[PDB]
């Protein structure tokens, strides 16, 4: 049943959040999945609300792979969770735990947390942009049928189980593709720093202790 996999519908469910990530290349609308990755969703929404991501660059842009942002240092070495130095129950100093779900996958459009090892989630996030038909390459036995089908349109299945997925692009995939396109023949294109202008929380979500 495709309804068990919330990335397969653009409709924002009762227990889903919604944001608009305004970028120098256009607006990307994402829904988030606090039911399955509550730490990554709270971390991202809280940083977004406080302006932590404002004017940050997409510091990694790799065509047919993913686009990545959320590093105040702009080179992949920085960023921290909202709990670093504040709540050791959530972040002991090196980041928060991965949140792997059998309902969420690195299909094209998936929003995920970057990490420097399992359970080192800070503030860096990436959007899966790959467009390769990944269906045949999958170990079918280990993937739900609806997800094998969805992987026809692209994704990074090698990342499944290793990184938290916590959202999905529901509008503006063309913007994600335009950002990714800047890595193609970059030797013949003008220098360009792509930035997040702001993140508008359309439908917030909050968490209980």
Author numbering: 60 to 268
From the paper:
Here, we solved the protein structures of two secreted parvulin and two secreted cyclophilin-like peptidyl-prolyl isomerase (PPIase) ATP-independent chaperones found in gram-positive streptococcal species. Two types of ATP-independent extracellular PPIases exist in pathogenic streptococci: the parvulin and cyclophilin families. Unlike cytoplasmic PPIases, extracellular PPIases have canonical secretion signal peptides that allow for their translocation across the cell membrane via the Sec pathway. These chaperones are lipidated to the outer leaflet of the membrane and function in the space between the bacterial membrane and cell wall.
We then solved the crystal structures of SlrA homologs from S. pneumoniae (SpnSlrA) and S. pyogenes (SpyPpiA) to 1.88 Å and 1.28 Å resolution, respectively, using single-wavelength anomalous diffraction (SAD) data from selenomethionine derivatized crystals. Although the expression construct encodes residues 21–268, three residues of the purification tag and 39 N-terminal residues were disordered in the crystal; thus, only residues 60–268 could be resolved. Superimposition of chains A from the SpnSlrA and SpyPpiA structures confirms that their structures are homologous and share good alignment with an r.m.s.d. of 2.08 Å. The SpnSlrA and SpyPpiA proteins have a canonical cyclophilin fold comprised of eight antiparallel β-strands (SpnSlrA: β1, 72–81; β2, 82–90; β3, 112–120; β4, 121–127; β5, 166–173; β6, 181–188; β7, 221–227; β8, 250–260) that form a β-barrel with two α-helices (SpnSlrA: α1,95–108; α2, 230–240) located at the top and the bottom of the barrel. Both structures also contain extra secondary structural elements adjacent to the β-barrel composed of residues 189–212 (η2, 193–195; η3, 203–211; η4, 215–217). SpnSlrA putative active site residues Phe184 and His221 are identical to hCypA residues but are substituted by Tyr in SpyPpiA. Thus, we sought to determine whether these substitutions still allow for SpyPpiA PPiase activity. SpnSlrA, SpyPpiA, and hCypA all catalyzed the cis-to-trans isomerization of the N-succinyl-Ala-Ala-Pro-Phe-p-nitroanilide substrate. However, we observed ~20% decrease in PPIase activity of SpnSlrA and SpyPpiA compared to hCpyA. These data indicate that Tyr substitutions at key putative active site positions allow for PPIase activity in, at least, one streptococcal cyclophilin. Using affinity isothermal titration calorimetry (ITC), we determined that SpnSlrA and SpyPpiA bind to CsA with a dissociation constants (Kd) of 122.4 ± 41.4 nM and 365.7 ± 102.1 nM, respectively.
